[PDB]
């Protein structure tokens, strides 16, 4: 019986508003809060219904507060400006980390596994809310990284189709969507390759997928020296199975990952991160 209101932030309290990116849900800018003295992120798109969406997103971030979910700091709601304010993630997205190879030549295994564990922890948290909250748009672009490269998931429960399960083409009630996305992401994290790299059309991907084809698993995509290779391959293969019923819950997924994570000393995570600086 304990409630908490989301702070309202006066637009005039946000200084140095610089453009970061624009996307389907709005434009994201970095700023600083004049009173709290911290860097923040601001998201802004006004139609009669376009308002109910921004407010629903903010309500979602506020209810889904957890260690691996992007923390919301407050709603900026005035007659002039309408925006969401959250912590600022200084390390970008998992997509950048995996694919900017000149900037990041080495991403050590312990850090890759910690990221995979945290993405699962975050999604598992969502699924355990009452009522259950489904992500449905999980991708490397919205898995964000904080100052120590810990995961904060964003843009859930509200572009690219490589993370979308086949049954989702021709559904909104499916609890086996997220795990599908997760299998692809896992493949992507362990290989640092773009899923279906030889495809010149999104439709060609969607076609292959509907026919049961998946990102390639072989020695070139996943070298034999990858720690716990066999176990990860099983997890990936069951996660993206054509038949949703054969896909594991996140509970099962976490239970499989726990013994893998225990094999890594806490200092190896710190060393992996400092290597990136």
The reply to whether 124 sits near a copy of itself by the rule CB under 8 A is yes
Q: Which two tokens stand for residue 37?
A: 């003295």
Question: What is the DSSP track for 21-35?
Answer: EEETTEEEEEEEETT
Q: Report the C-alpha gap between 24 and 45 in whole angstroms.
A: 9
- The torsion angles phi and psi of 129, rounded to 5 degrees, stand at -70, 160
Which of the stretches 79-87, 172-180, 205-213, 233-241 binds ligand 6GD when contact is defined by CB under 6 A? 79-87
- Residue 149 zone, left/alpha/beta (φ > 0; ψ -120 to 50; rest): left
Tokens 């691996």: give the residue: 68
β-strand pairing of 26-33 with 14-23: antiparallel
Site track 118-147 with ligand 6GD (rule: CB under 6 A), x = hit? --------------------------x---
Q: Report the C-alpha gap between 70 and 144 in whole angstroms.
A: 8
Contact 27, 43 (CB under 8 A): yes
Site track 71-100 with a copy of itself (rule: CB under 8 A), x = hit? x-x-x-----------x-------------
State the catalytic residues. Answer: 137
Q: Report the C-alpha gap between 124 and 64 in whole angstroms.
A: 11
Compute how many residues bind a copy of itself; rule: CB under 8 A: 42
As measured in angstroms, the least distance from the Cβ of 18 to a copy of itself is: 17
Nearer to ligand 6GD, 174 or 194 (CB): 194
The reply to whether 44 sits near a copy of itself by the rule CB under 8 A is no
Within 200-239, the residues that bind ligand 6GD by CB under 6 A are: none
Among 16, 78, 148, 197, binds a copy of itself (CB under 8 A): 148
Among 203, 229, 258, 263, binds a copy of itself (CB under 8 A): 258
End-to-end CA distance of the chain: 45
- Detail the residues annotated as belonging to a binding site for ATP: 20-28, 43
Return residues touching ligand 6GD (CB under 6 A): 20-21, 28, 41-43, 70, 84-86, 88-89, 92-93, 144, 154-155
- Detail the residues annotated as belonging to a binding site: 20-28, 43
């Amino acid at each position: 019986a304990i409630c908490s209101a989301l702070p309202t932030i006066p637009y005039h309290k946000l200084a140095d508003l610089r453009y970061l990116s624009r996307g389907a849900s709005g434009t994201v800018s970095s700023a600083r809060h004049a009173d709290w003295r911290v860097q923040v992120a601001v998201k802004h798109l006004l139609l009669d219904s376009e308002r109910k969406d921004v407010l629903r997103e903010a309500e979602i971030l506020h209810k889904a507060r957890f260690s691996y979910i992007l923390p919301i700091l407050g709603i900026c709601n005035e007659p002039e400006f309408l925006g969401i304010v959250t912590e600022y993630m200084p390390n970008g997205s998992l997509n950048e980390l995996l694919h900017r190879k000149t900037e990041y030549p080495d991403v050590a295994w312990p850090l890759r596994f910690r990221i995979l564990h945290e993405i699962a922890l975050g999604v598992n948290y969502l699924h355990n809310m009452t009522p259950p909250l489904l992500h449905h748009d999980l991708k490397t672009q919205n898995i964000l990284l904080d100052n120590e490269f810990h995961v904060k998931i964003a843009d859930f429960g509200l572009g690219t189709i490589i993370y979308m399960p086949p049954e989702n083409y021709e559904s909104r009630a499916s609890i086996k969507h997220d795990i599908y996305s997760y299998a692809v992401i896992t493949w992507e994290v362990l290989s640092r390759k773009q899923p279906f790299e030889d495809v010149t059309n999104p439709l060609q991907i969607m076609y292959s997928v509907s026919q049961g084809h998946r990102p390639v698993i072989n020695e070139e995509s996943l070298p034999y020296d990858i720690p716990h290779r066999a176990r990860m391959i099983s997890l990936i293969e069951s996660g993206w199975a054509q038949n949703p019923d054969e896909r594991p819950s996140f509970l099962k997924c976490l239970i499989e990952l726990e013994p893998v994570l225990r094999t890594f000393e806490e200092i190896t995570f710190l060393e992996a991160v400092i290597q990136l600086k």
